[PDB]
A paper describes a structure:
Crystals of native CHI and CHI_H33A were soaked in the substrate (2R,3R)-dihydroquercetin ((+)-taxifolin, Protein Data Bank (PDB) three-letter code DQH) and X-ray diffraction data were collected. The electron-density maps of native CHI soaked with DQH show a complicated disorder in the active sites. Clearly, this structure analysis is not the doubtless identification of a distinct molecule in the active site, but more of a snapshot of the enzyme at work. The C6-C3-C6 framework cannot be clearly identified as one of the possible substrate or product molecules. We see two electron density bubbles at the positions of the A and B ring, but a gap for the connection. This can be interpreted as a superposition of substrate, intermediates, and product caused by equilibria on the reaction pathway. The observed electron density might be caused by alternative substrate and product binding in the active sites, but additionally, the reaction intermediates, the chalcone and the di-keto-tautomer, should be considered. Initial crystallographic refinement was tested with each of the four molecules of the reaction pathway. According to refinement statistics and electron density maps, the final model building and refinement was performed with the taxifolin chalcone, which marginally turned out as the best. No additional substrate binding in the active site was observed.
Numbering used by the authors:
A (entry chain D), D (entry chain C): 1 to 107, 130 to 282
B (entry chain F), C (entry chain B), F (entry chain A): 1 to 106, 130 to 282
E (entry chain E): 1 to 110, 131 to 282
């Protein structure tokens, strides 16, 4: 049977729940996970990249801040096609990785693995159209949200656009707003939206995403007292990243060369 | 909604209208334009290459000769899909680029010619079976668009029944390939892209200038001699080599400057 | 017209019929064939790799053992689409290559076996979940095609109900994978591709020679022992490693010679 | 005249004095500084790499912790040879870079530029000889020190190797100790030693470098009350880094590709 | 015996004497010469690059203008050490290449131009104008020129002329943004050239204004081999190229074989 | 203190004493040894390459034939300088590697042969001027060390006045190169490295076995026939191709596994 041409960009929000885990998690990612991954999908993934998160900002924990990285893939086919379950070589994946990323708690309950599929192009351009790289360095705050069980999706959308987006648009500190609807049909991801919101720096982020958002009234479905009113790491995940990453893995990886 | 699998090769004819602009245009292309471009389409363009033009030959001006390069992309999806208009980072594009390439004057402006094609040539009209072992080629790539109110079928008939026979008769011409432009993608005025190979500039001239004097002047002619089309508007061209070092998705390592 | 999205993995079984031909065949493959191939299909082939065969094992000749390599491509479109027949530059292909690989004699010629598959194995029959951490594999890749007038369904039933169970039972065998050949693409005579992993040559021999002695000789047998198929015509194979340095779209930098 | 074969490894300790500067400094480093640098020394530098610092640990400020990265070069000739002062193209260097790194304040004192030359091979192997990458992920604490004005160098050396290093050796948390003398003859660097001290993690670092070092008595020349007893960023600089960096710039750099 | 550490930058001035030869010469360079060269010196050459020449400017012929490229190597050891003459695989080098480049004439009837291979230190010895120029300051038209004074001209006198008569005209011209110079290492391979200069402009017009028009003010030296600056015999005592800041042909990093256009 | 500029090429003769060890040895070399090595010497080694050996020829065992590969390094400094003994990260080195290569048995082990040379061959004795255009070479690289108490000058005289003239006379032999081993670096027992080219295995055998029967057996002979030296102890060799894909500082991208 045929395989469908299904170009998509996916994002995984990778946390590191303790600094003591960082060397181990980082080693697994770069030493073990990259080659396993390329080995499997080189023929049908056109880009595979890691975007290390900037230092967690103040109150970033309330946004499900990924303290390790964003993992980004560009697919030509759906990885959730059941035919793609068969692999000559399976990935080397210690259960410890789940501890390091917080999927399993210190045994807190655990945090889910958030793997959001999107179209390759942003669906909505809500602020900053025409911005070039010449305009300067961006503090790029990528955030995914999923409305809690039994909140009507259209009602969540209405909240987002009526209440939240206008505050982003109004803030001179915010230079760019982009959004896409999560493709729910692919893997049953709980998230509904991915937004990217750019600032000049952490202080700008905080002014807008913490101080300006104090004006919002608390929705009836709120799972925390303040914006984003969603349960950290379960219904909201995020990372602040730079414009550039050296970890463009299909082009740039040359093995796990160690420092002398 | 779905995105359609639309594998295509595109060619852009990049001129440099004065030698005094060459350093600036070349810098923009290699220093600024490459990274902006790769940044945008790395996931759905499988090849992105520049083919620097050989020195403009005698009477090359009459063929809309691109004095900088051909720019070549291989796409997996149509770039003219409206959904692809949204970009996180837009390209850095000074207005001066338009002057350098001759789109804007600083007597008359020339259009930006961006022709989409299938990835494989539709017609193989001479030289089938030629290998790289057979020698170095002077590859004359030429695109033409018939003027307003010329029946396309009539233009096609002229091309294939009058023009190509002259190419076939010349032993100096080693290869003829052609494809119809995909006009449905971006409204390009051009109708055909041909590639015509010679051994060298003198062969090109003997055939494309001297042998073509035998053609009679069509009624729609916009100039007295072949190609009878308005330079840079209804005909563009470049002569290029078999190989380019500028295979940008594989070969680019930043704008390293000479010491 | 449209081109169909047709992701496929293909395998070619490349023999070297005499050791005296090995330097010449290897030179052609790496010096001439790689650049010709990349030149043609860079935009619509996502991976192009050679897997050198391990030394031919005892009785390997009876399995149509490829003494040079497996050649592997990953395609986004069918290479047998008639539109893909047209190429600006054709491959440089000396007739001697056919001699070296045994397609023609300098007793009897062997066919060119080019099998198209889906990119993912259809059947996982032993060893699901094996990781690279579990150790080095001796990977025996084997393709078979039932002789003329053997019912395909009957051959399939034999393969999966008689042959594969012997593989499954052997502790020496760590992995069994299989896919049906896509016969609709290029008319390949082969019906199945299997990959069967061992620890080493001795394990391969214990299972593929000694354990297979238990099989009844089918009525259609073309040789007395498993695989009961005519070497190089109805069975081809190679044993290869997990890794190859010849990942050609990523790793090739020209034919640099030893000092 | 001849050029001397002078193989050396150099380290630069690159700070970022405010989180608000991080995007700008990081952009300059990766977008502007890399190509300028490669352009100049590609023919006589065999390796050029950046090692991003792990998050600053508790009390890391007291160690002159470089909040951006270590910059590492391997030279075949001395960069301080006066003939090497001439360059066709000079580096693009906004004065703001000095602000971002803390060399100058915002329009005697910011912090000096610390550029330490070493031999390519560590001179002293004081703990953990034989360690392989198979033995696990390392938290690699690289630290350079320079004794203050009018402290006898031999006396400082004796203190380092007879008082400080024994505490490192006694700690099971410390898996590796390496040291080299700074080549002072190259560029007049104030630093005298570079050490690298490995731990499993941040907690190990802190247990040893803060808690175990409380047992040291305060030298007469001390410029702060606790180990390392040297003035942060002036007489001590440091960074904790991983075994691997994706920023192996002579091999891995493909231009400043921006995230979509 | 020991090999001496001898870091050097070399330049070869590669001409193409007819446009009809360009496809063949270019094919040889990129298809045959690159891999042969890398095969030989990968272990002791740290950079190998080609800088294609800009279109020959007006009166460029009088400057021994190389119509193909500059070839640039960075050596760790002297290639003229006699021990380096032995090579497992020798370069494939048809005598036709010499025709294409103008070293020999095309066909026996009843001199061409010499091969100019100049060794330099890796760093310019003299920075005479434009110190501190960055890439941010804009695109350069980089005119690289090598000169060798004719037989029986005192070298010190030639030097004094160069630096005290010629360079001041460059200094006075606002069109000229950079002047760099090094003495040729004559001890390596007996090259006739004495100096390599690089002189930067914004563009061809600037080059011409300065190197042709402003130089008309020079008086003609007694040793002159032509009436106008540079007063030296084209291709024999003067060679040159105008090149860009950047080349895609950084061959040790960038070469992936002779991939042909579709 | 200073480090001396000491440009050298070194060769290591890597055997594989049983086919059952080949997957494991090959995995260690490509998965573990490459990154460990690059990690250590990237800043002062300009080239690091593996040349896989062709199949062992008839009687190749008598020449200490390396059944895995030649390992080749180009150094800027002496790796045997005692200061280079200190390394942040030591190589991961299972003792089994010594079994696989035959240094240790599962009576007698074979030594590790690591020969340092100048980067350029000292003697060109046949085939000067041969280019890659002249064809594919079967390159037989052989190192020899005269036994204890044989005068070195006498061995040299034998090599160059008795052995090499047989190579010179044979039309099957297209190239002879030789260098003296640098004994001062690491105490290597070997005295010479030669490379001797043929067209193929048959040519190798005709010359190195049949033509060498004419030599009289030296008094110091450790075996009856040429090379008259103890296999793997006083003679080691490999036949290799002109090209290797394993140019490790340029070409390595991690241990990507076959699908
Ligand atoms: O990036 C991760 C990853 O493996 C994604 C992925 C790729 C291919 C698949 O078939 C698939 O199901 C998932 C990733 C990561 O970056 C960190 C982790 O802990 C786990 C991951 O899967
Ligand atoms: O090649 C050019 C180019 O930018 C093509 C292109 C790329 C991405 C798109 O989305 C698109 O619509 C077009 C190009 C060039 O080479 C020179 C120029 O002056 C302008 C160009 O666009
Ligand atoms: O791999 C080979 C190859 O060329 C396959 C192929 C590609 C495109 C086509 O149109 C086609 O018909 C075949 C290959 C090889 O690896 C070795 C050979 O000797 C010949 C080959 O074709
Ligand atoms: O490492 C930096 C740097 O400037 C190095 C250097 C190398 C060679 C020279 O001749 C020279 O003058 C300087 C560096 C860096 O890597 C990051 C920064 O943010 C600032 C730096 O100076
Ligand atoms: O690069 C060229 C070249 O041949 C250099 C060289 C190297 C070693 C030698 O011993 C020697 O004599 C020369 C070169 C080129 O790149 C292009 C040309 O057109 C001509 C050249 O010589
Ligand atoms: O390449 C090998 C190797 O390790 C060489 C080497 C490097 C540095 C040293 O200090 C040293 O003593 C040796 C190598 C190989 O390629 C295969 C092997 O089996 C063993 C090796 O050492
Ligand atoms: Cl913590
Ligand atoms: Cl586990
Ligand atoms: Cl900025
Ligand atoms: Cl709360
Ligand atoms: Cl749809
Ligand atoms: Cl019109
Ligand atoms: Cl008619
Ligand atoms: Cl006209
Ligand atoms: Cl259709
Ligand atoms: Cl044989
Ligand atoms: Cl049959
Ligand atoms: Cl049976
Ligand atoms: Cl039989
Ligand atoms: Cl690549
Ligand atoms: Cl801060
Ligand atoms: Cl002080
Ligand atoms: Cl204090
Ligand atoms: Cl000496
Ligand atoms: Cl400019
Ligand atoms: Cl003269
Ligand atoms: Cl004159
Ligand atoms: Cl590289
Ligand atoms: Cl065996
Ligand atoms: Cl051959
Ligand atoms: Cl002995
Ligand atoms: Cl014997
Ligand atoms: K204390
Ligand atoms: K004059
Ligand atoms: K004998």
């Amino acid at each position: 049977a045929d395989f469908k041409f299904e170009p998509m960009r996916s994002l995984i929000y990778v946390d590191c729940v303790s600094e003591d885990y960082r060397p181990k998690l980082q080693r697994w990612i770069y030493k073990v996970h990259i080659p396993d991954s390329i080995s499997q999908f080189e023929p049908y993934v056109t880009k595979y990249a890691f975007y290390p998160s900037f230092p967690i900002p103040p109150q970033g924990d309330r946004f499900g801040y990924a303290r390790m990285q964003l993992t980004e893939h560009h697919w030509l086919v759906s990885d959730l096609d059941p035919r793609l379950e068969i692999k000559a070589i399976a990935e080397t994946f210690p259960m410890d990785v789940l501890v390091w990323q917080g999927q399993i708690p210190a045994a807190a309950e655990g945090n889910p693995f958030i793997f959001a599929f999107l179209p390759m192009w942003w669906e909505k351009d809500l602020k900053g159209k025409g911005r070039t790289i010449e305009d300067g360095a961006n503090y790029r705050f990528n955030m995914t949200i999923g409305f809690p069980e039994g909140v009507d999706k259209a009602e969540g959308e209405k909240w987002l656009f009526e209440k939240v987006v206008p505050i982003l648009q109004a803030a001179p500190e915010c230079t760019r707003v982009l959004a896409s609807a999560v493709k729910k049909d692919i893997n049953g991801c709980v998230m509904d939206w991915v937004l990217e919101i750019w600032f000049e720096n952490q202080s700008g982020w905080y002014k807008v995403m913490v101080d300006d958002m104090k004006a919002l009234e608390k929705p009836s479905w709120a799972q925390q007292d303040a914006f984003p009113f969603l349960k950290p790491y379960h219904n909201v995940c995020s990372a602040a990243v730079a414009d550039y990453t050296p970890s463009n893995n299909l082009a740039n990886y040359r093995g796990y060369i160690t420092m002398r």
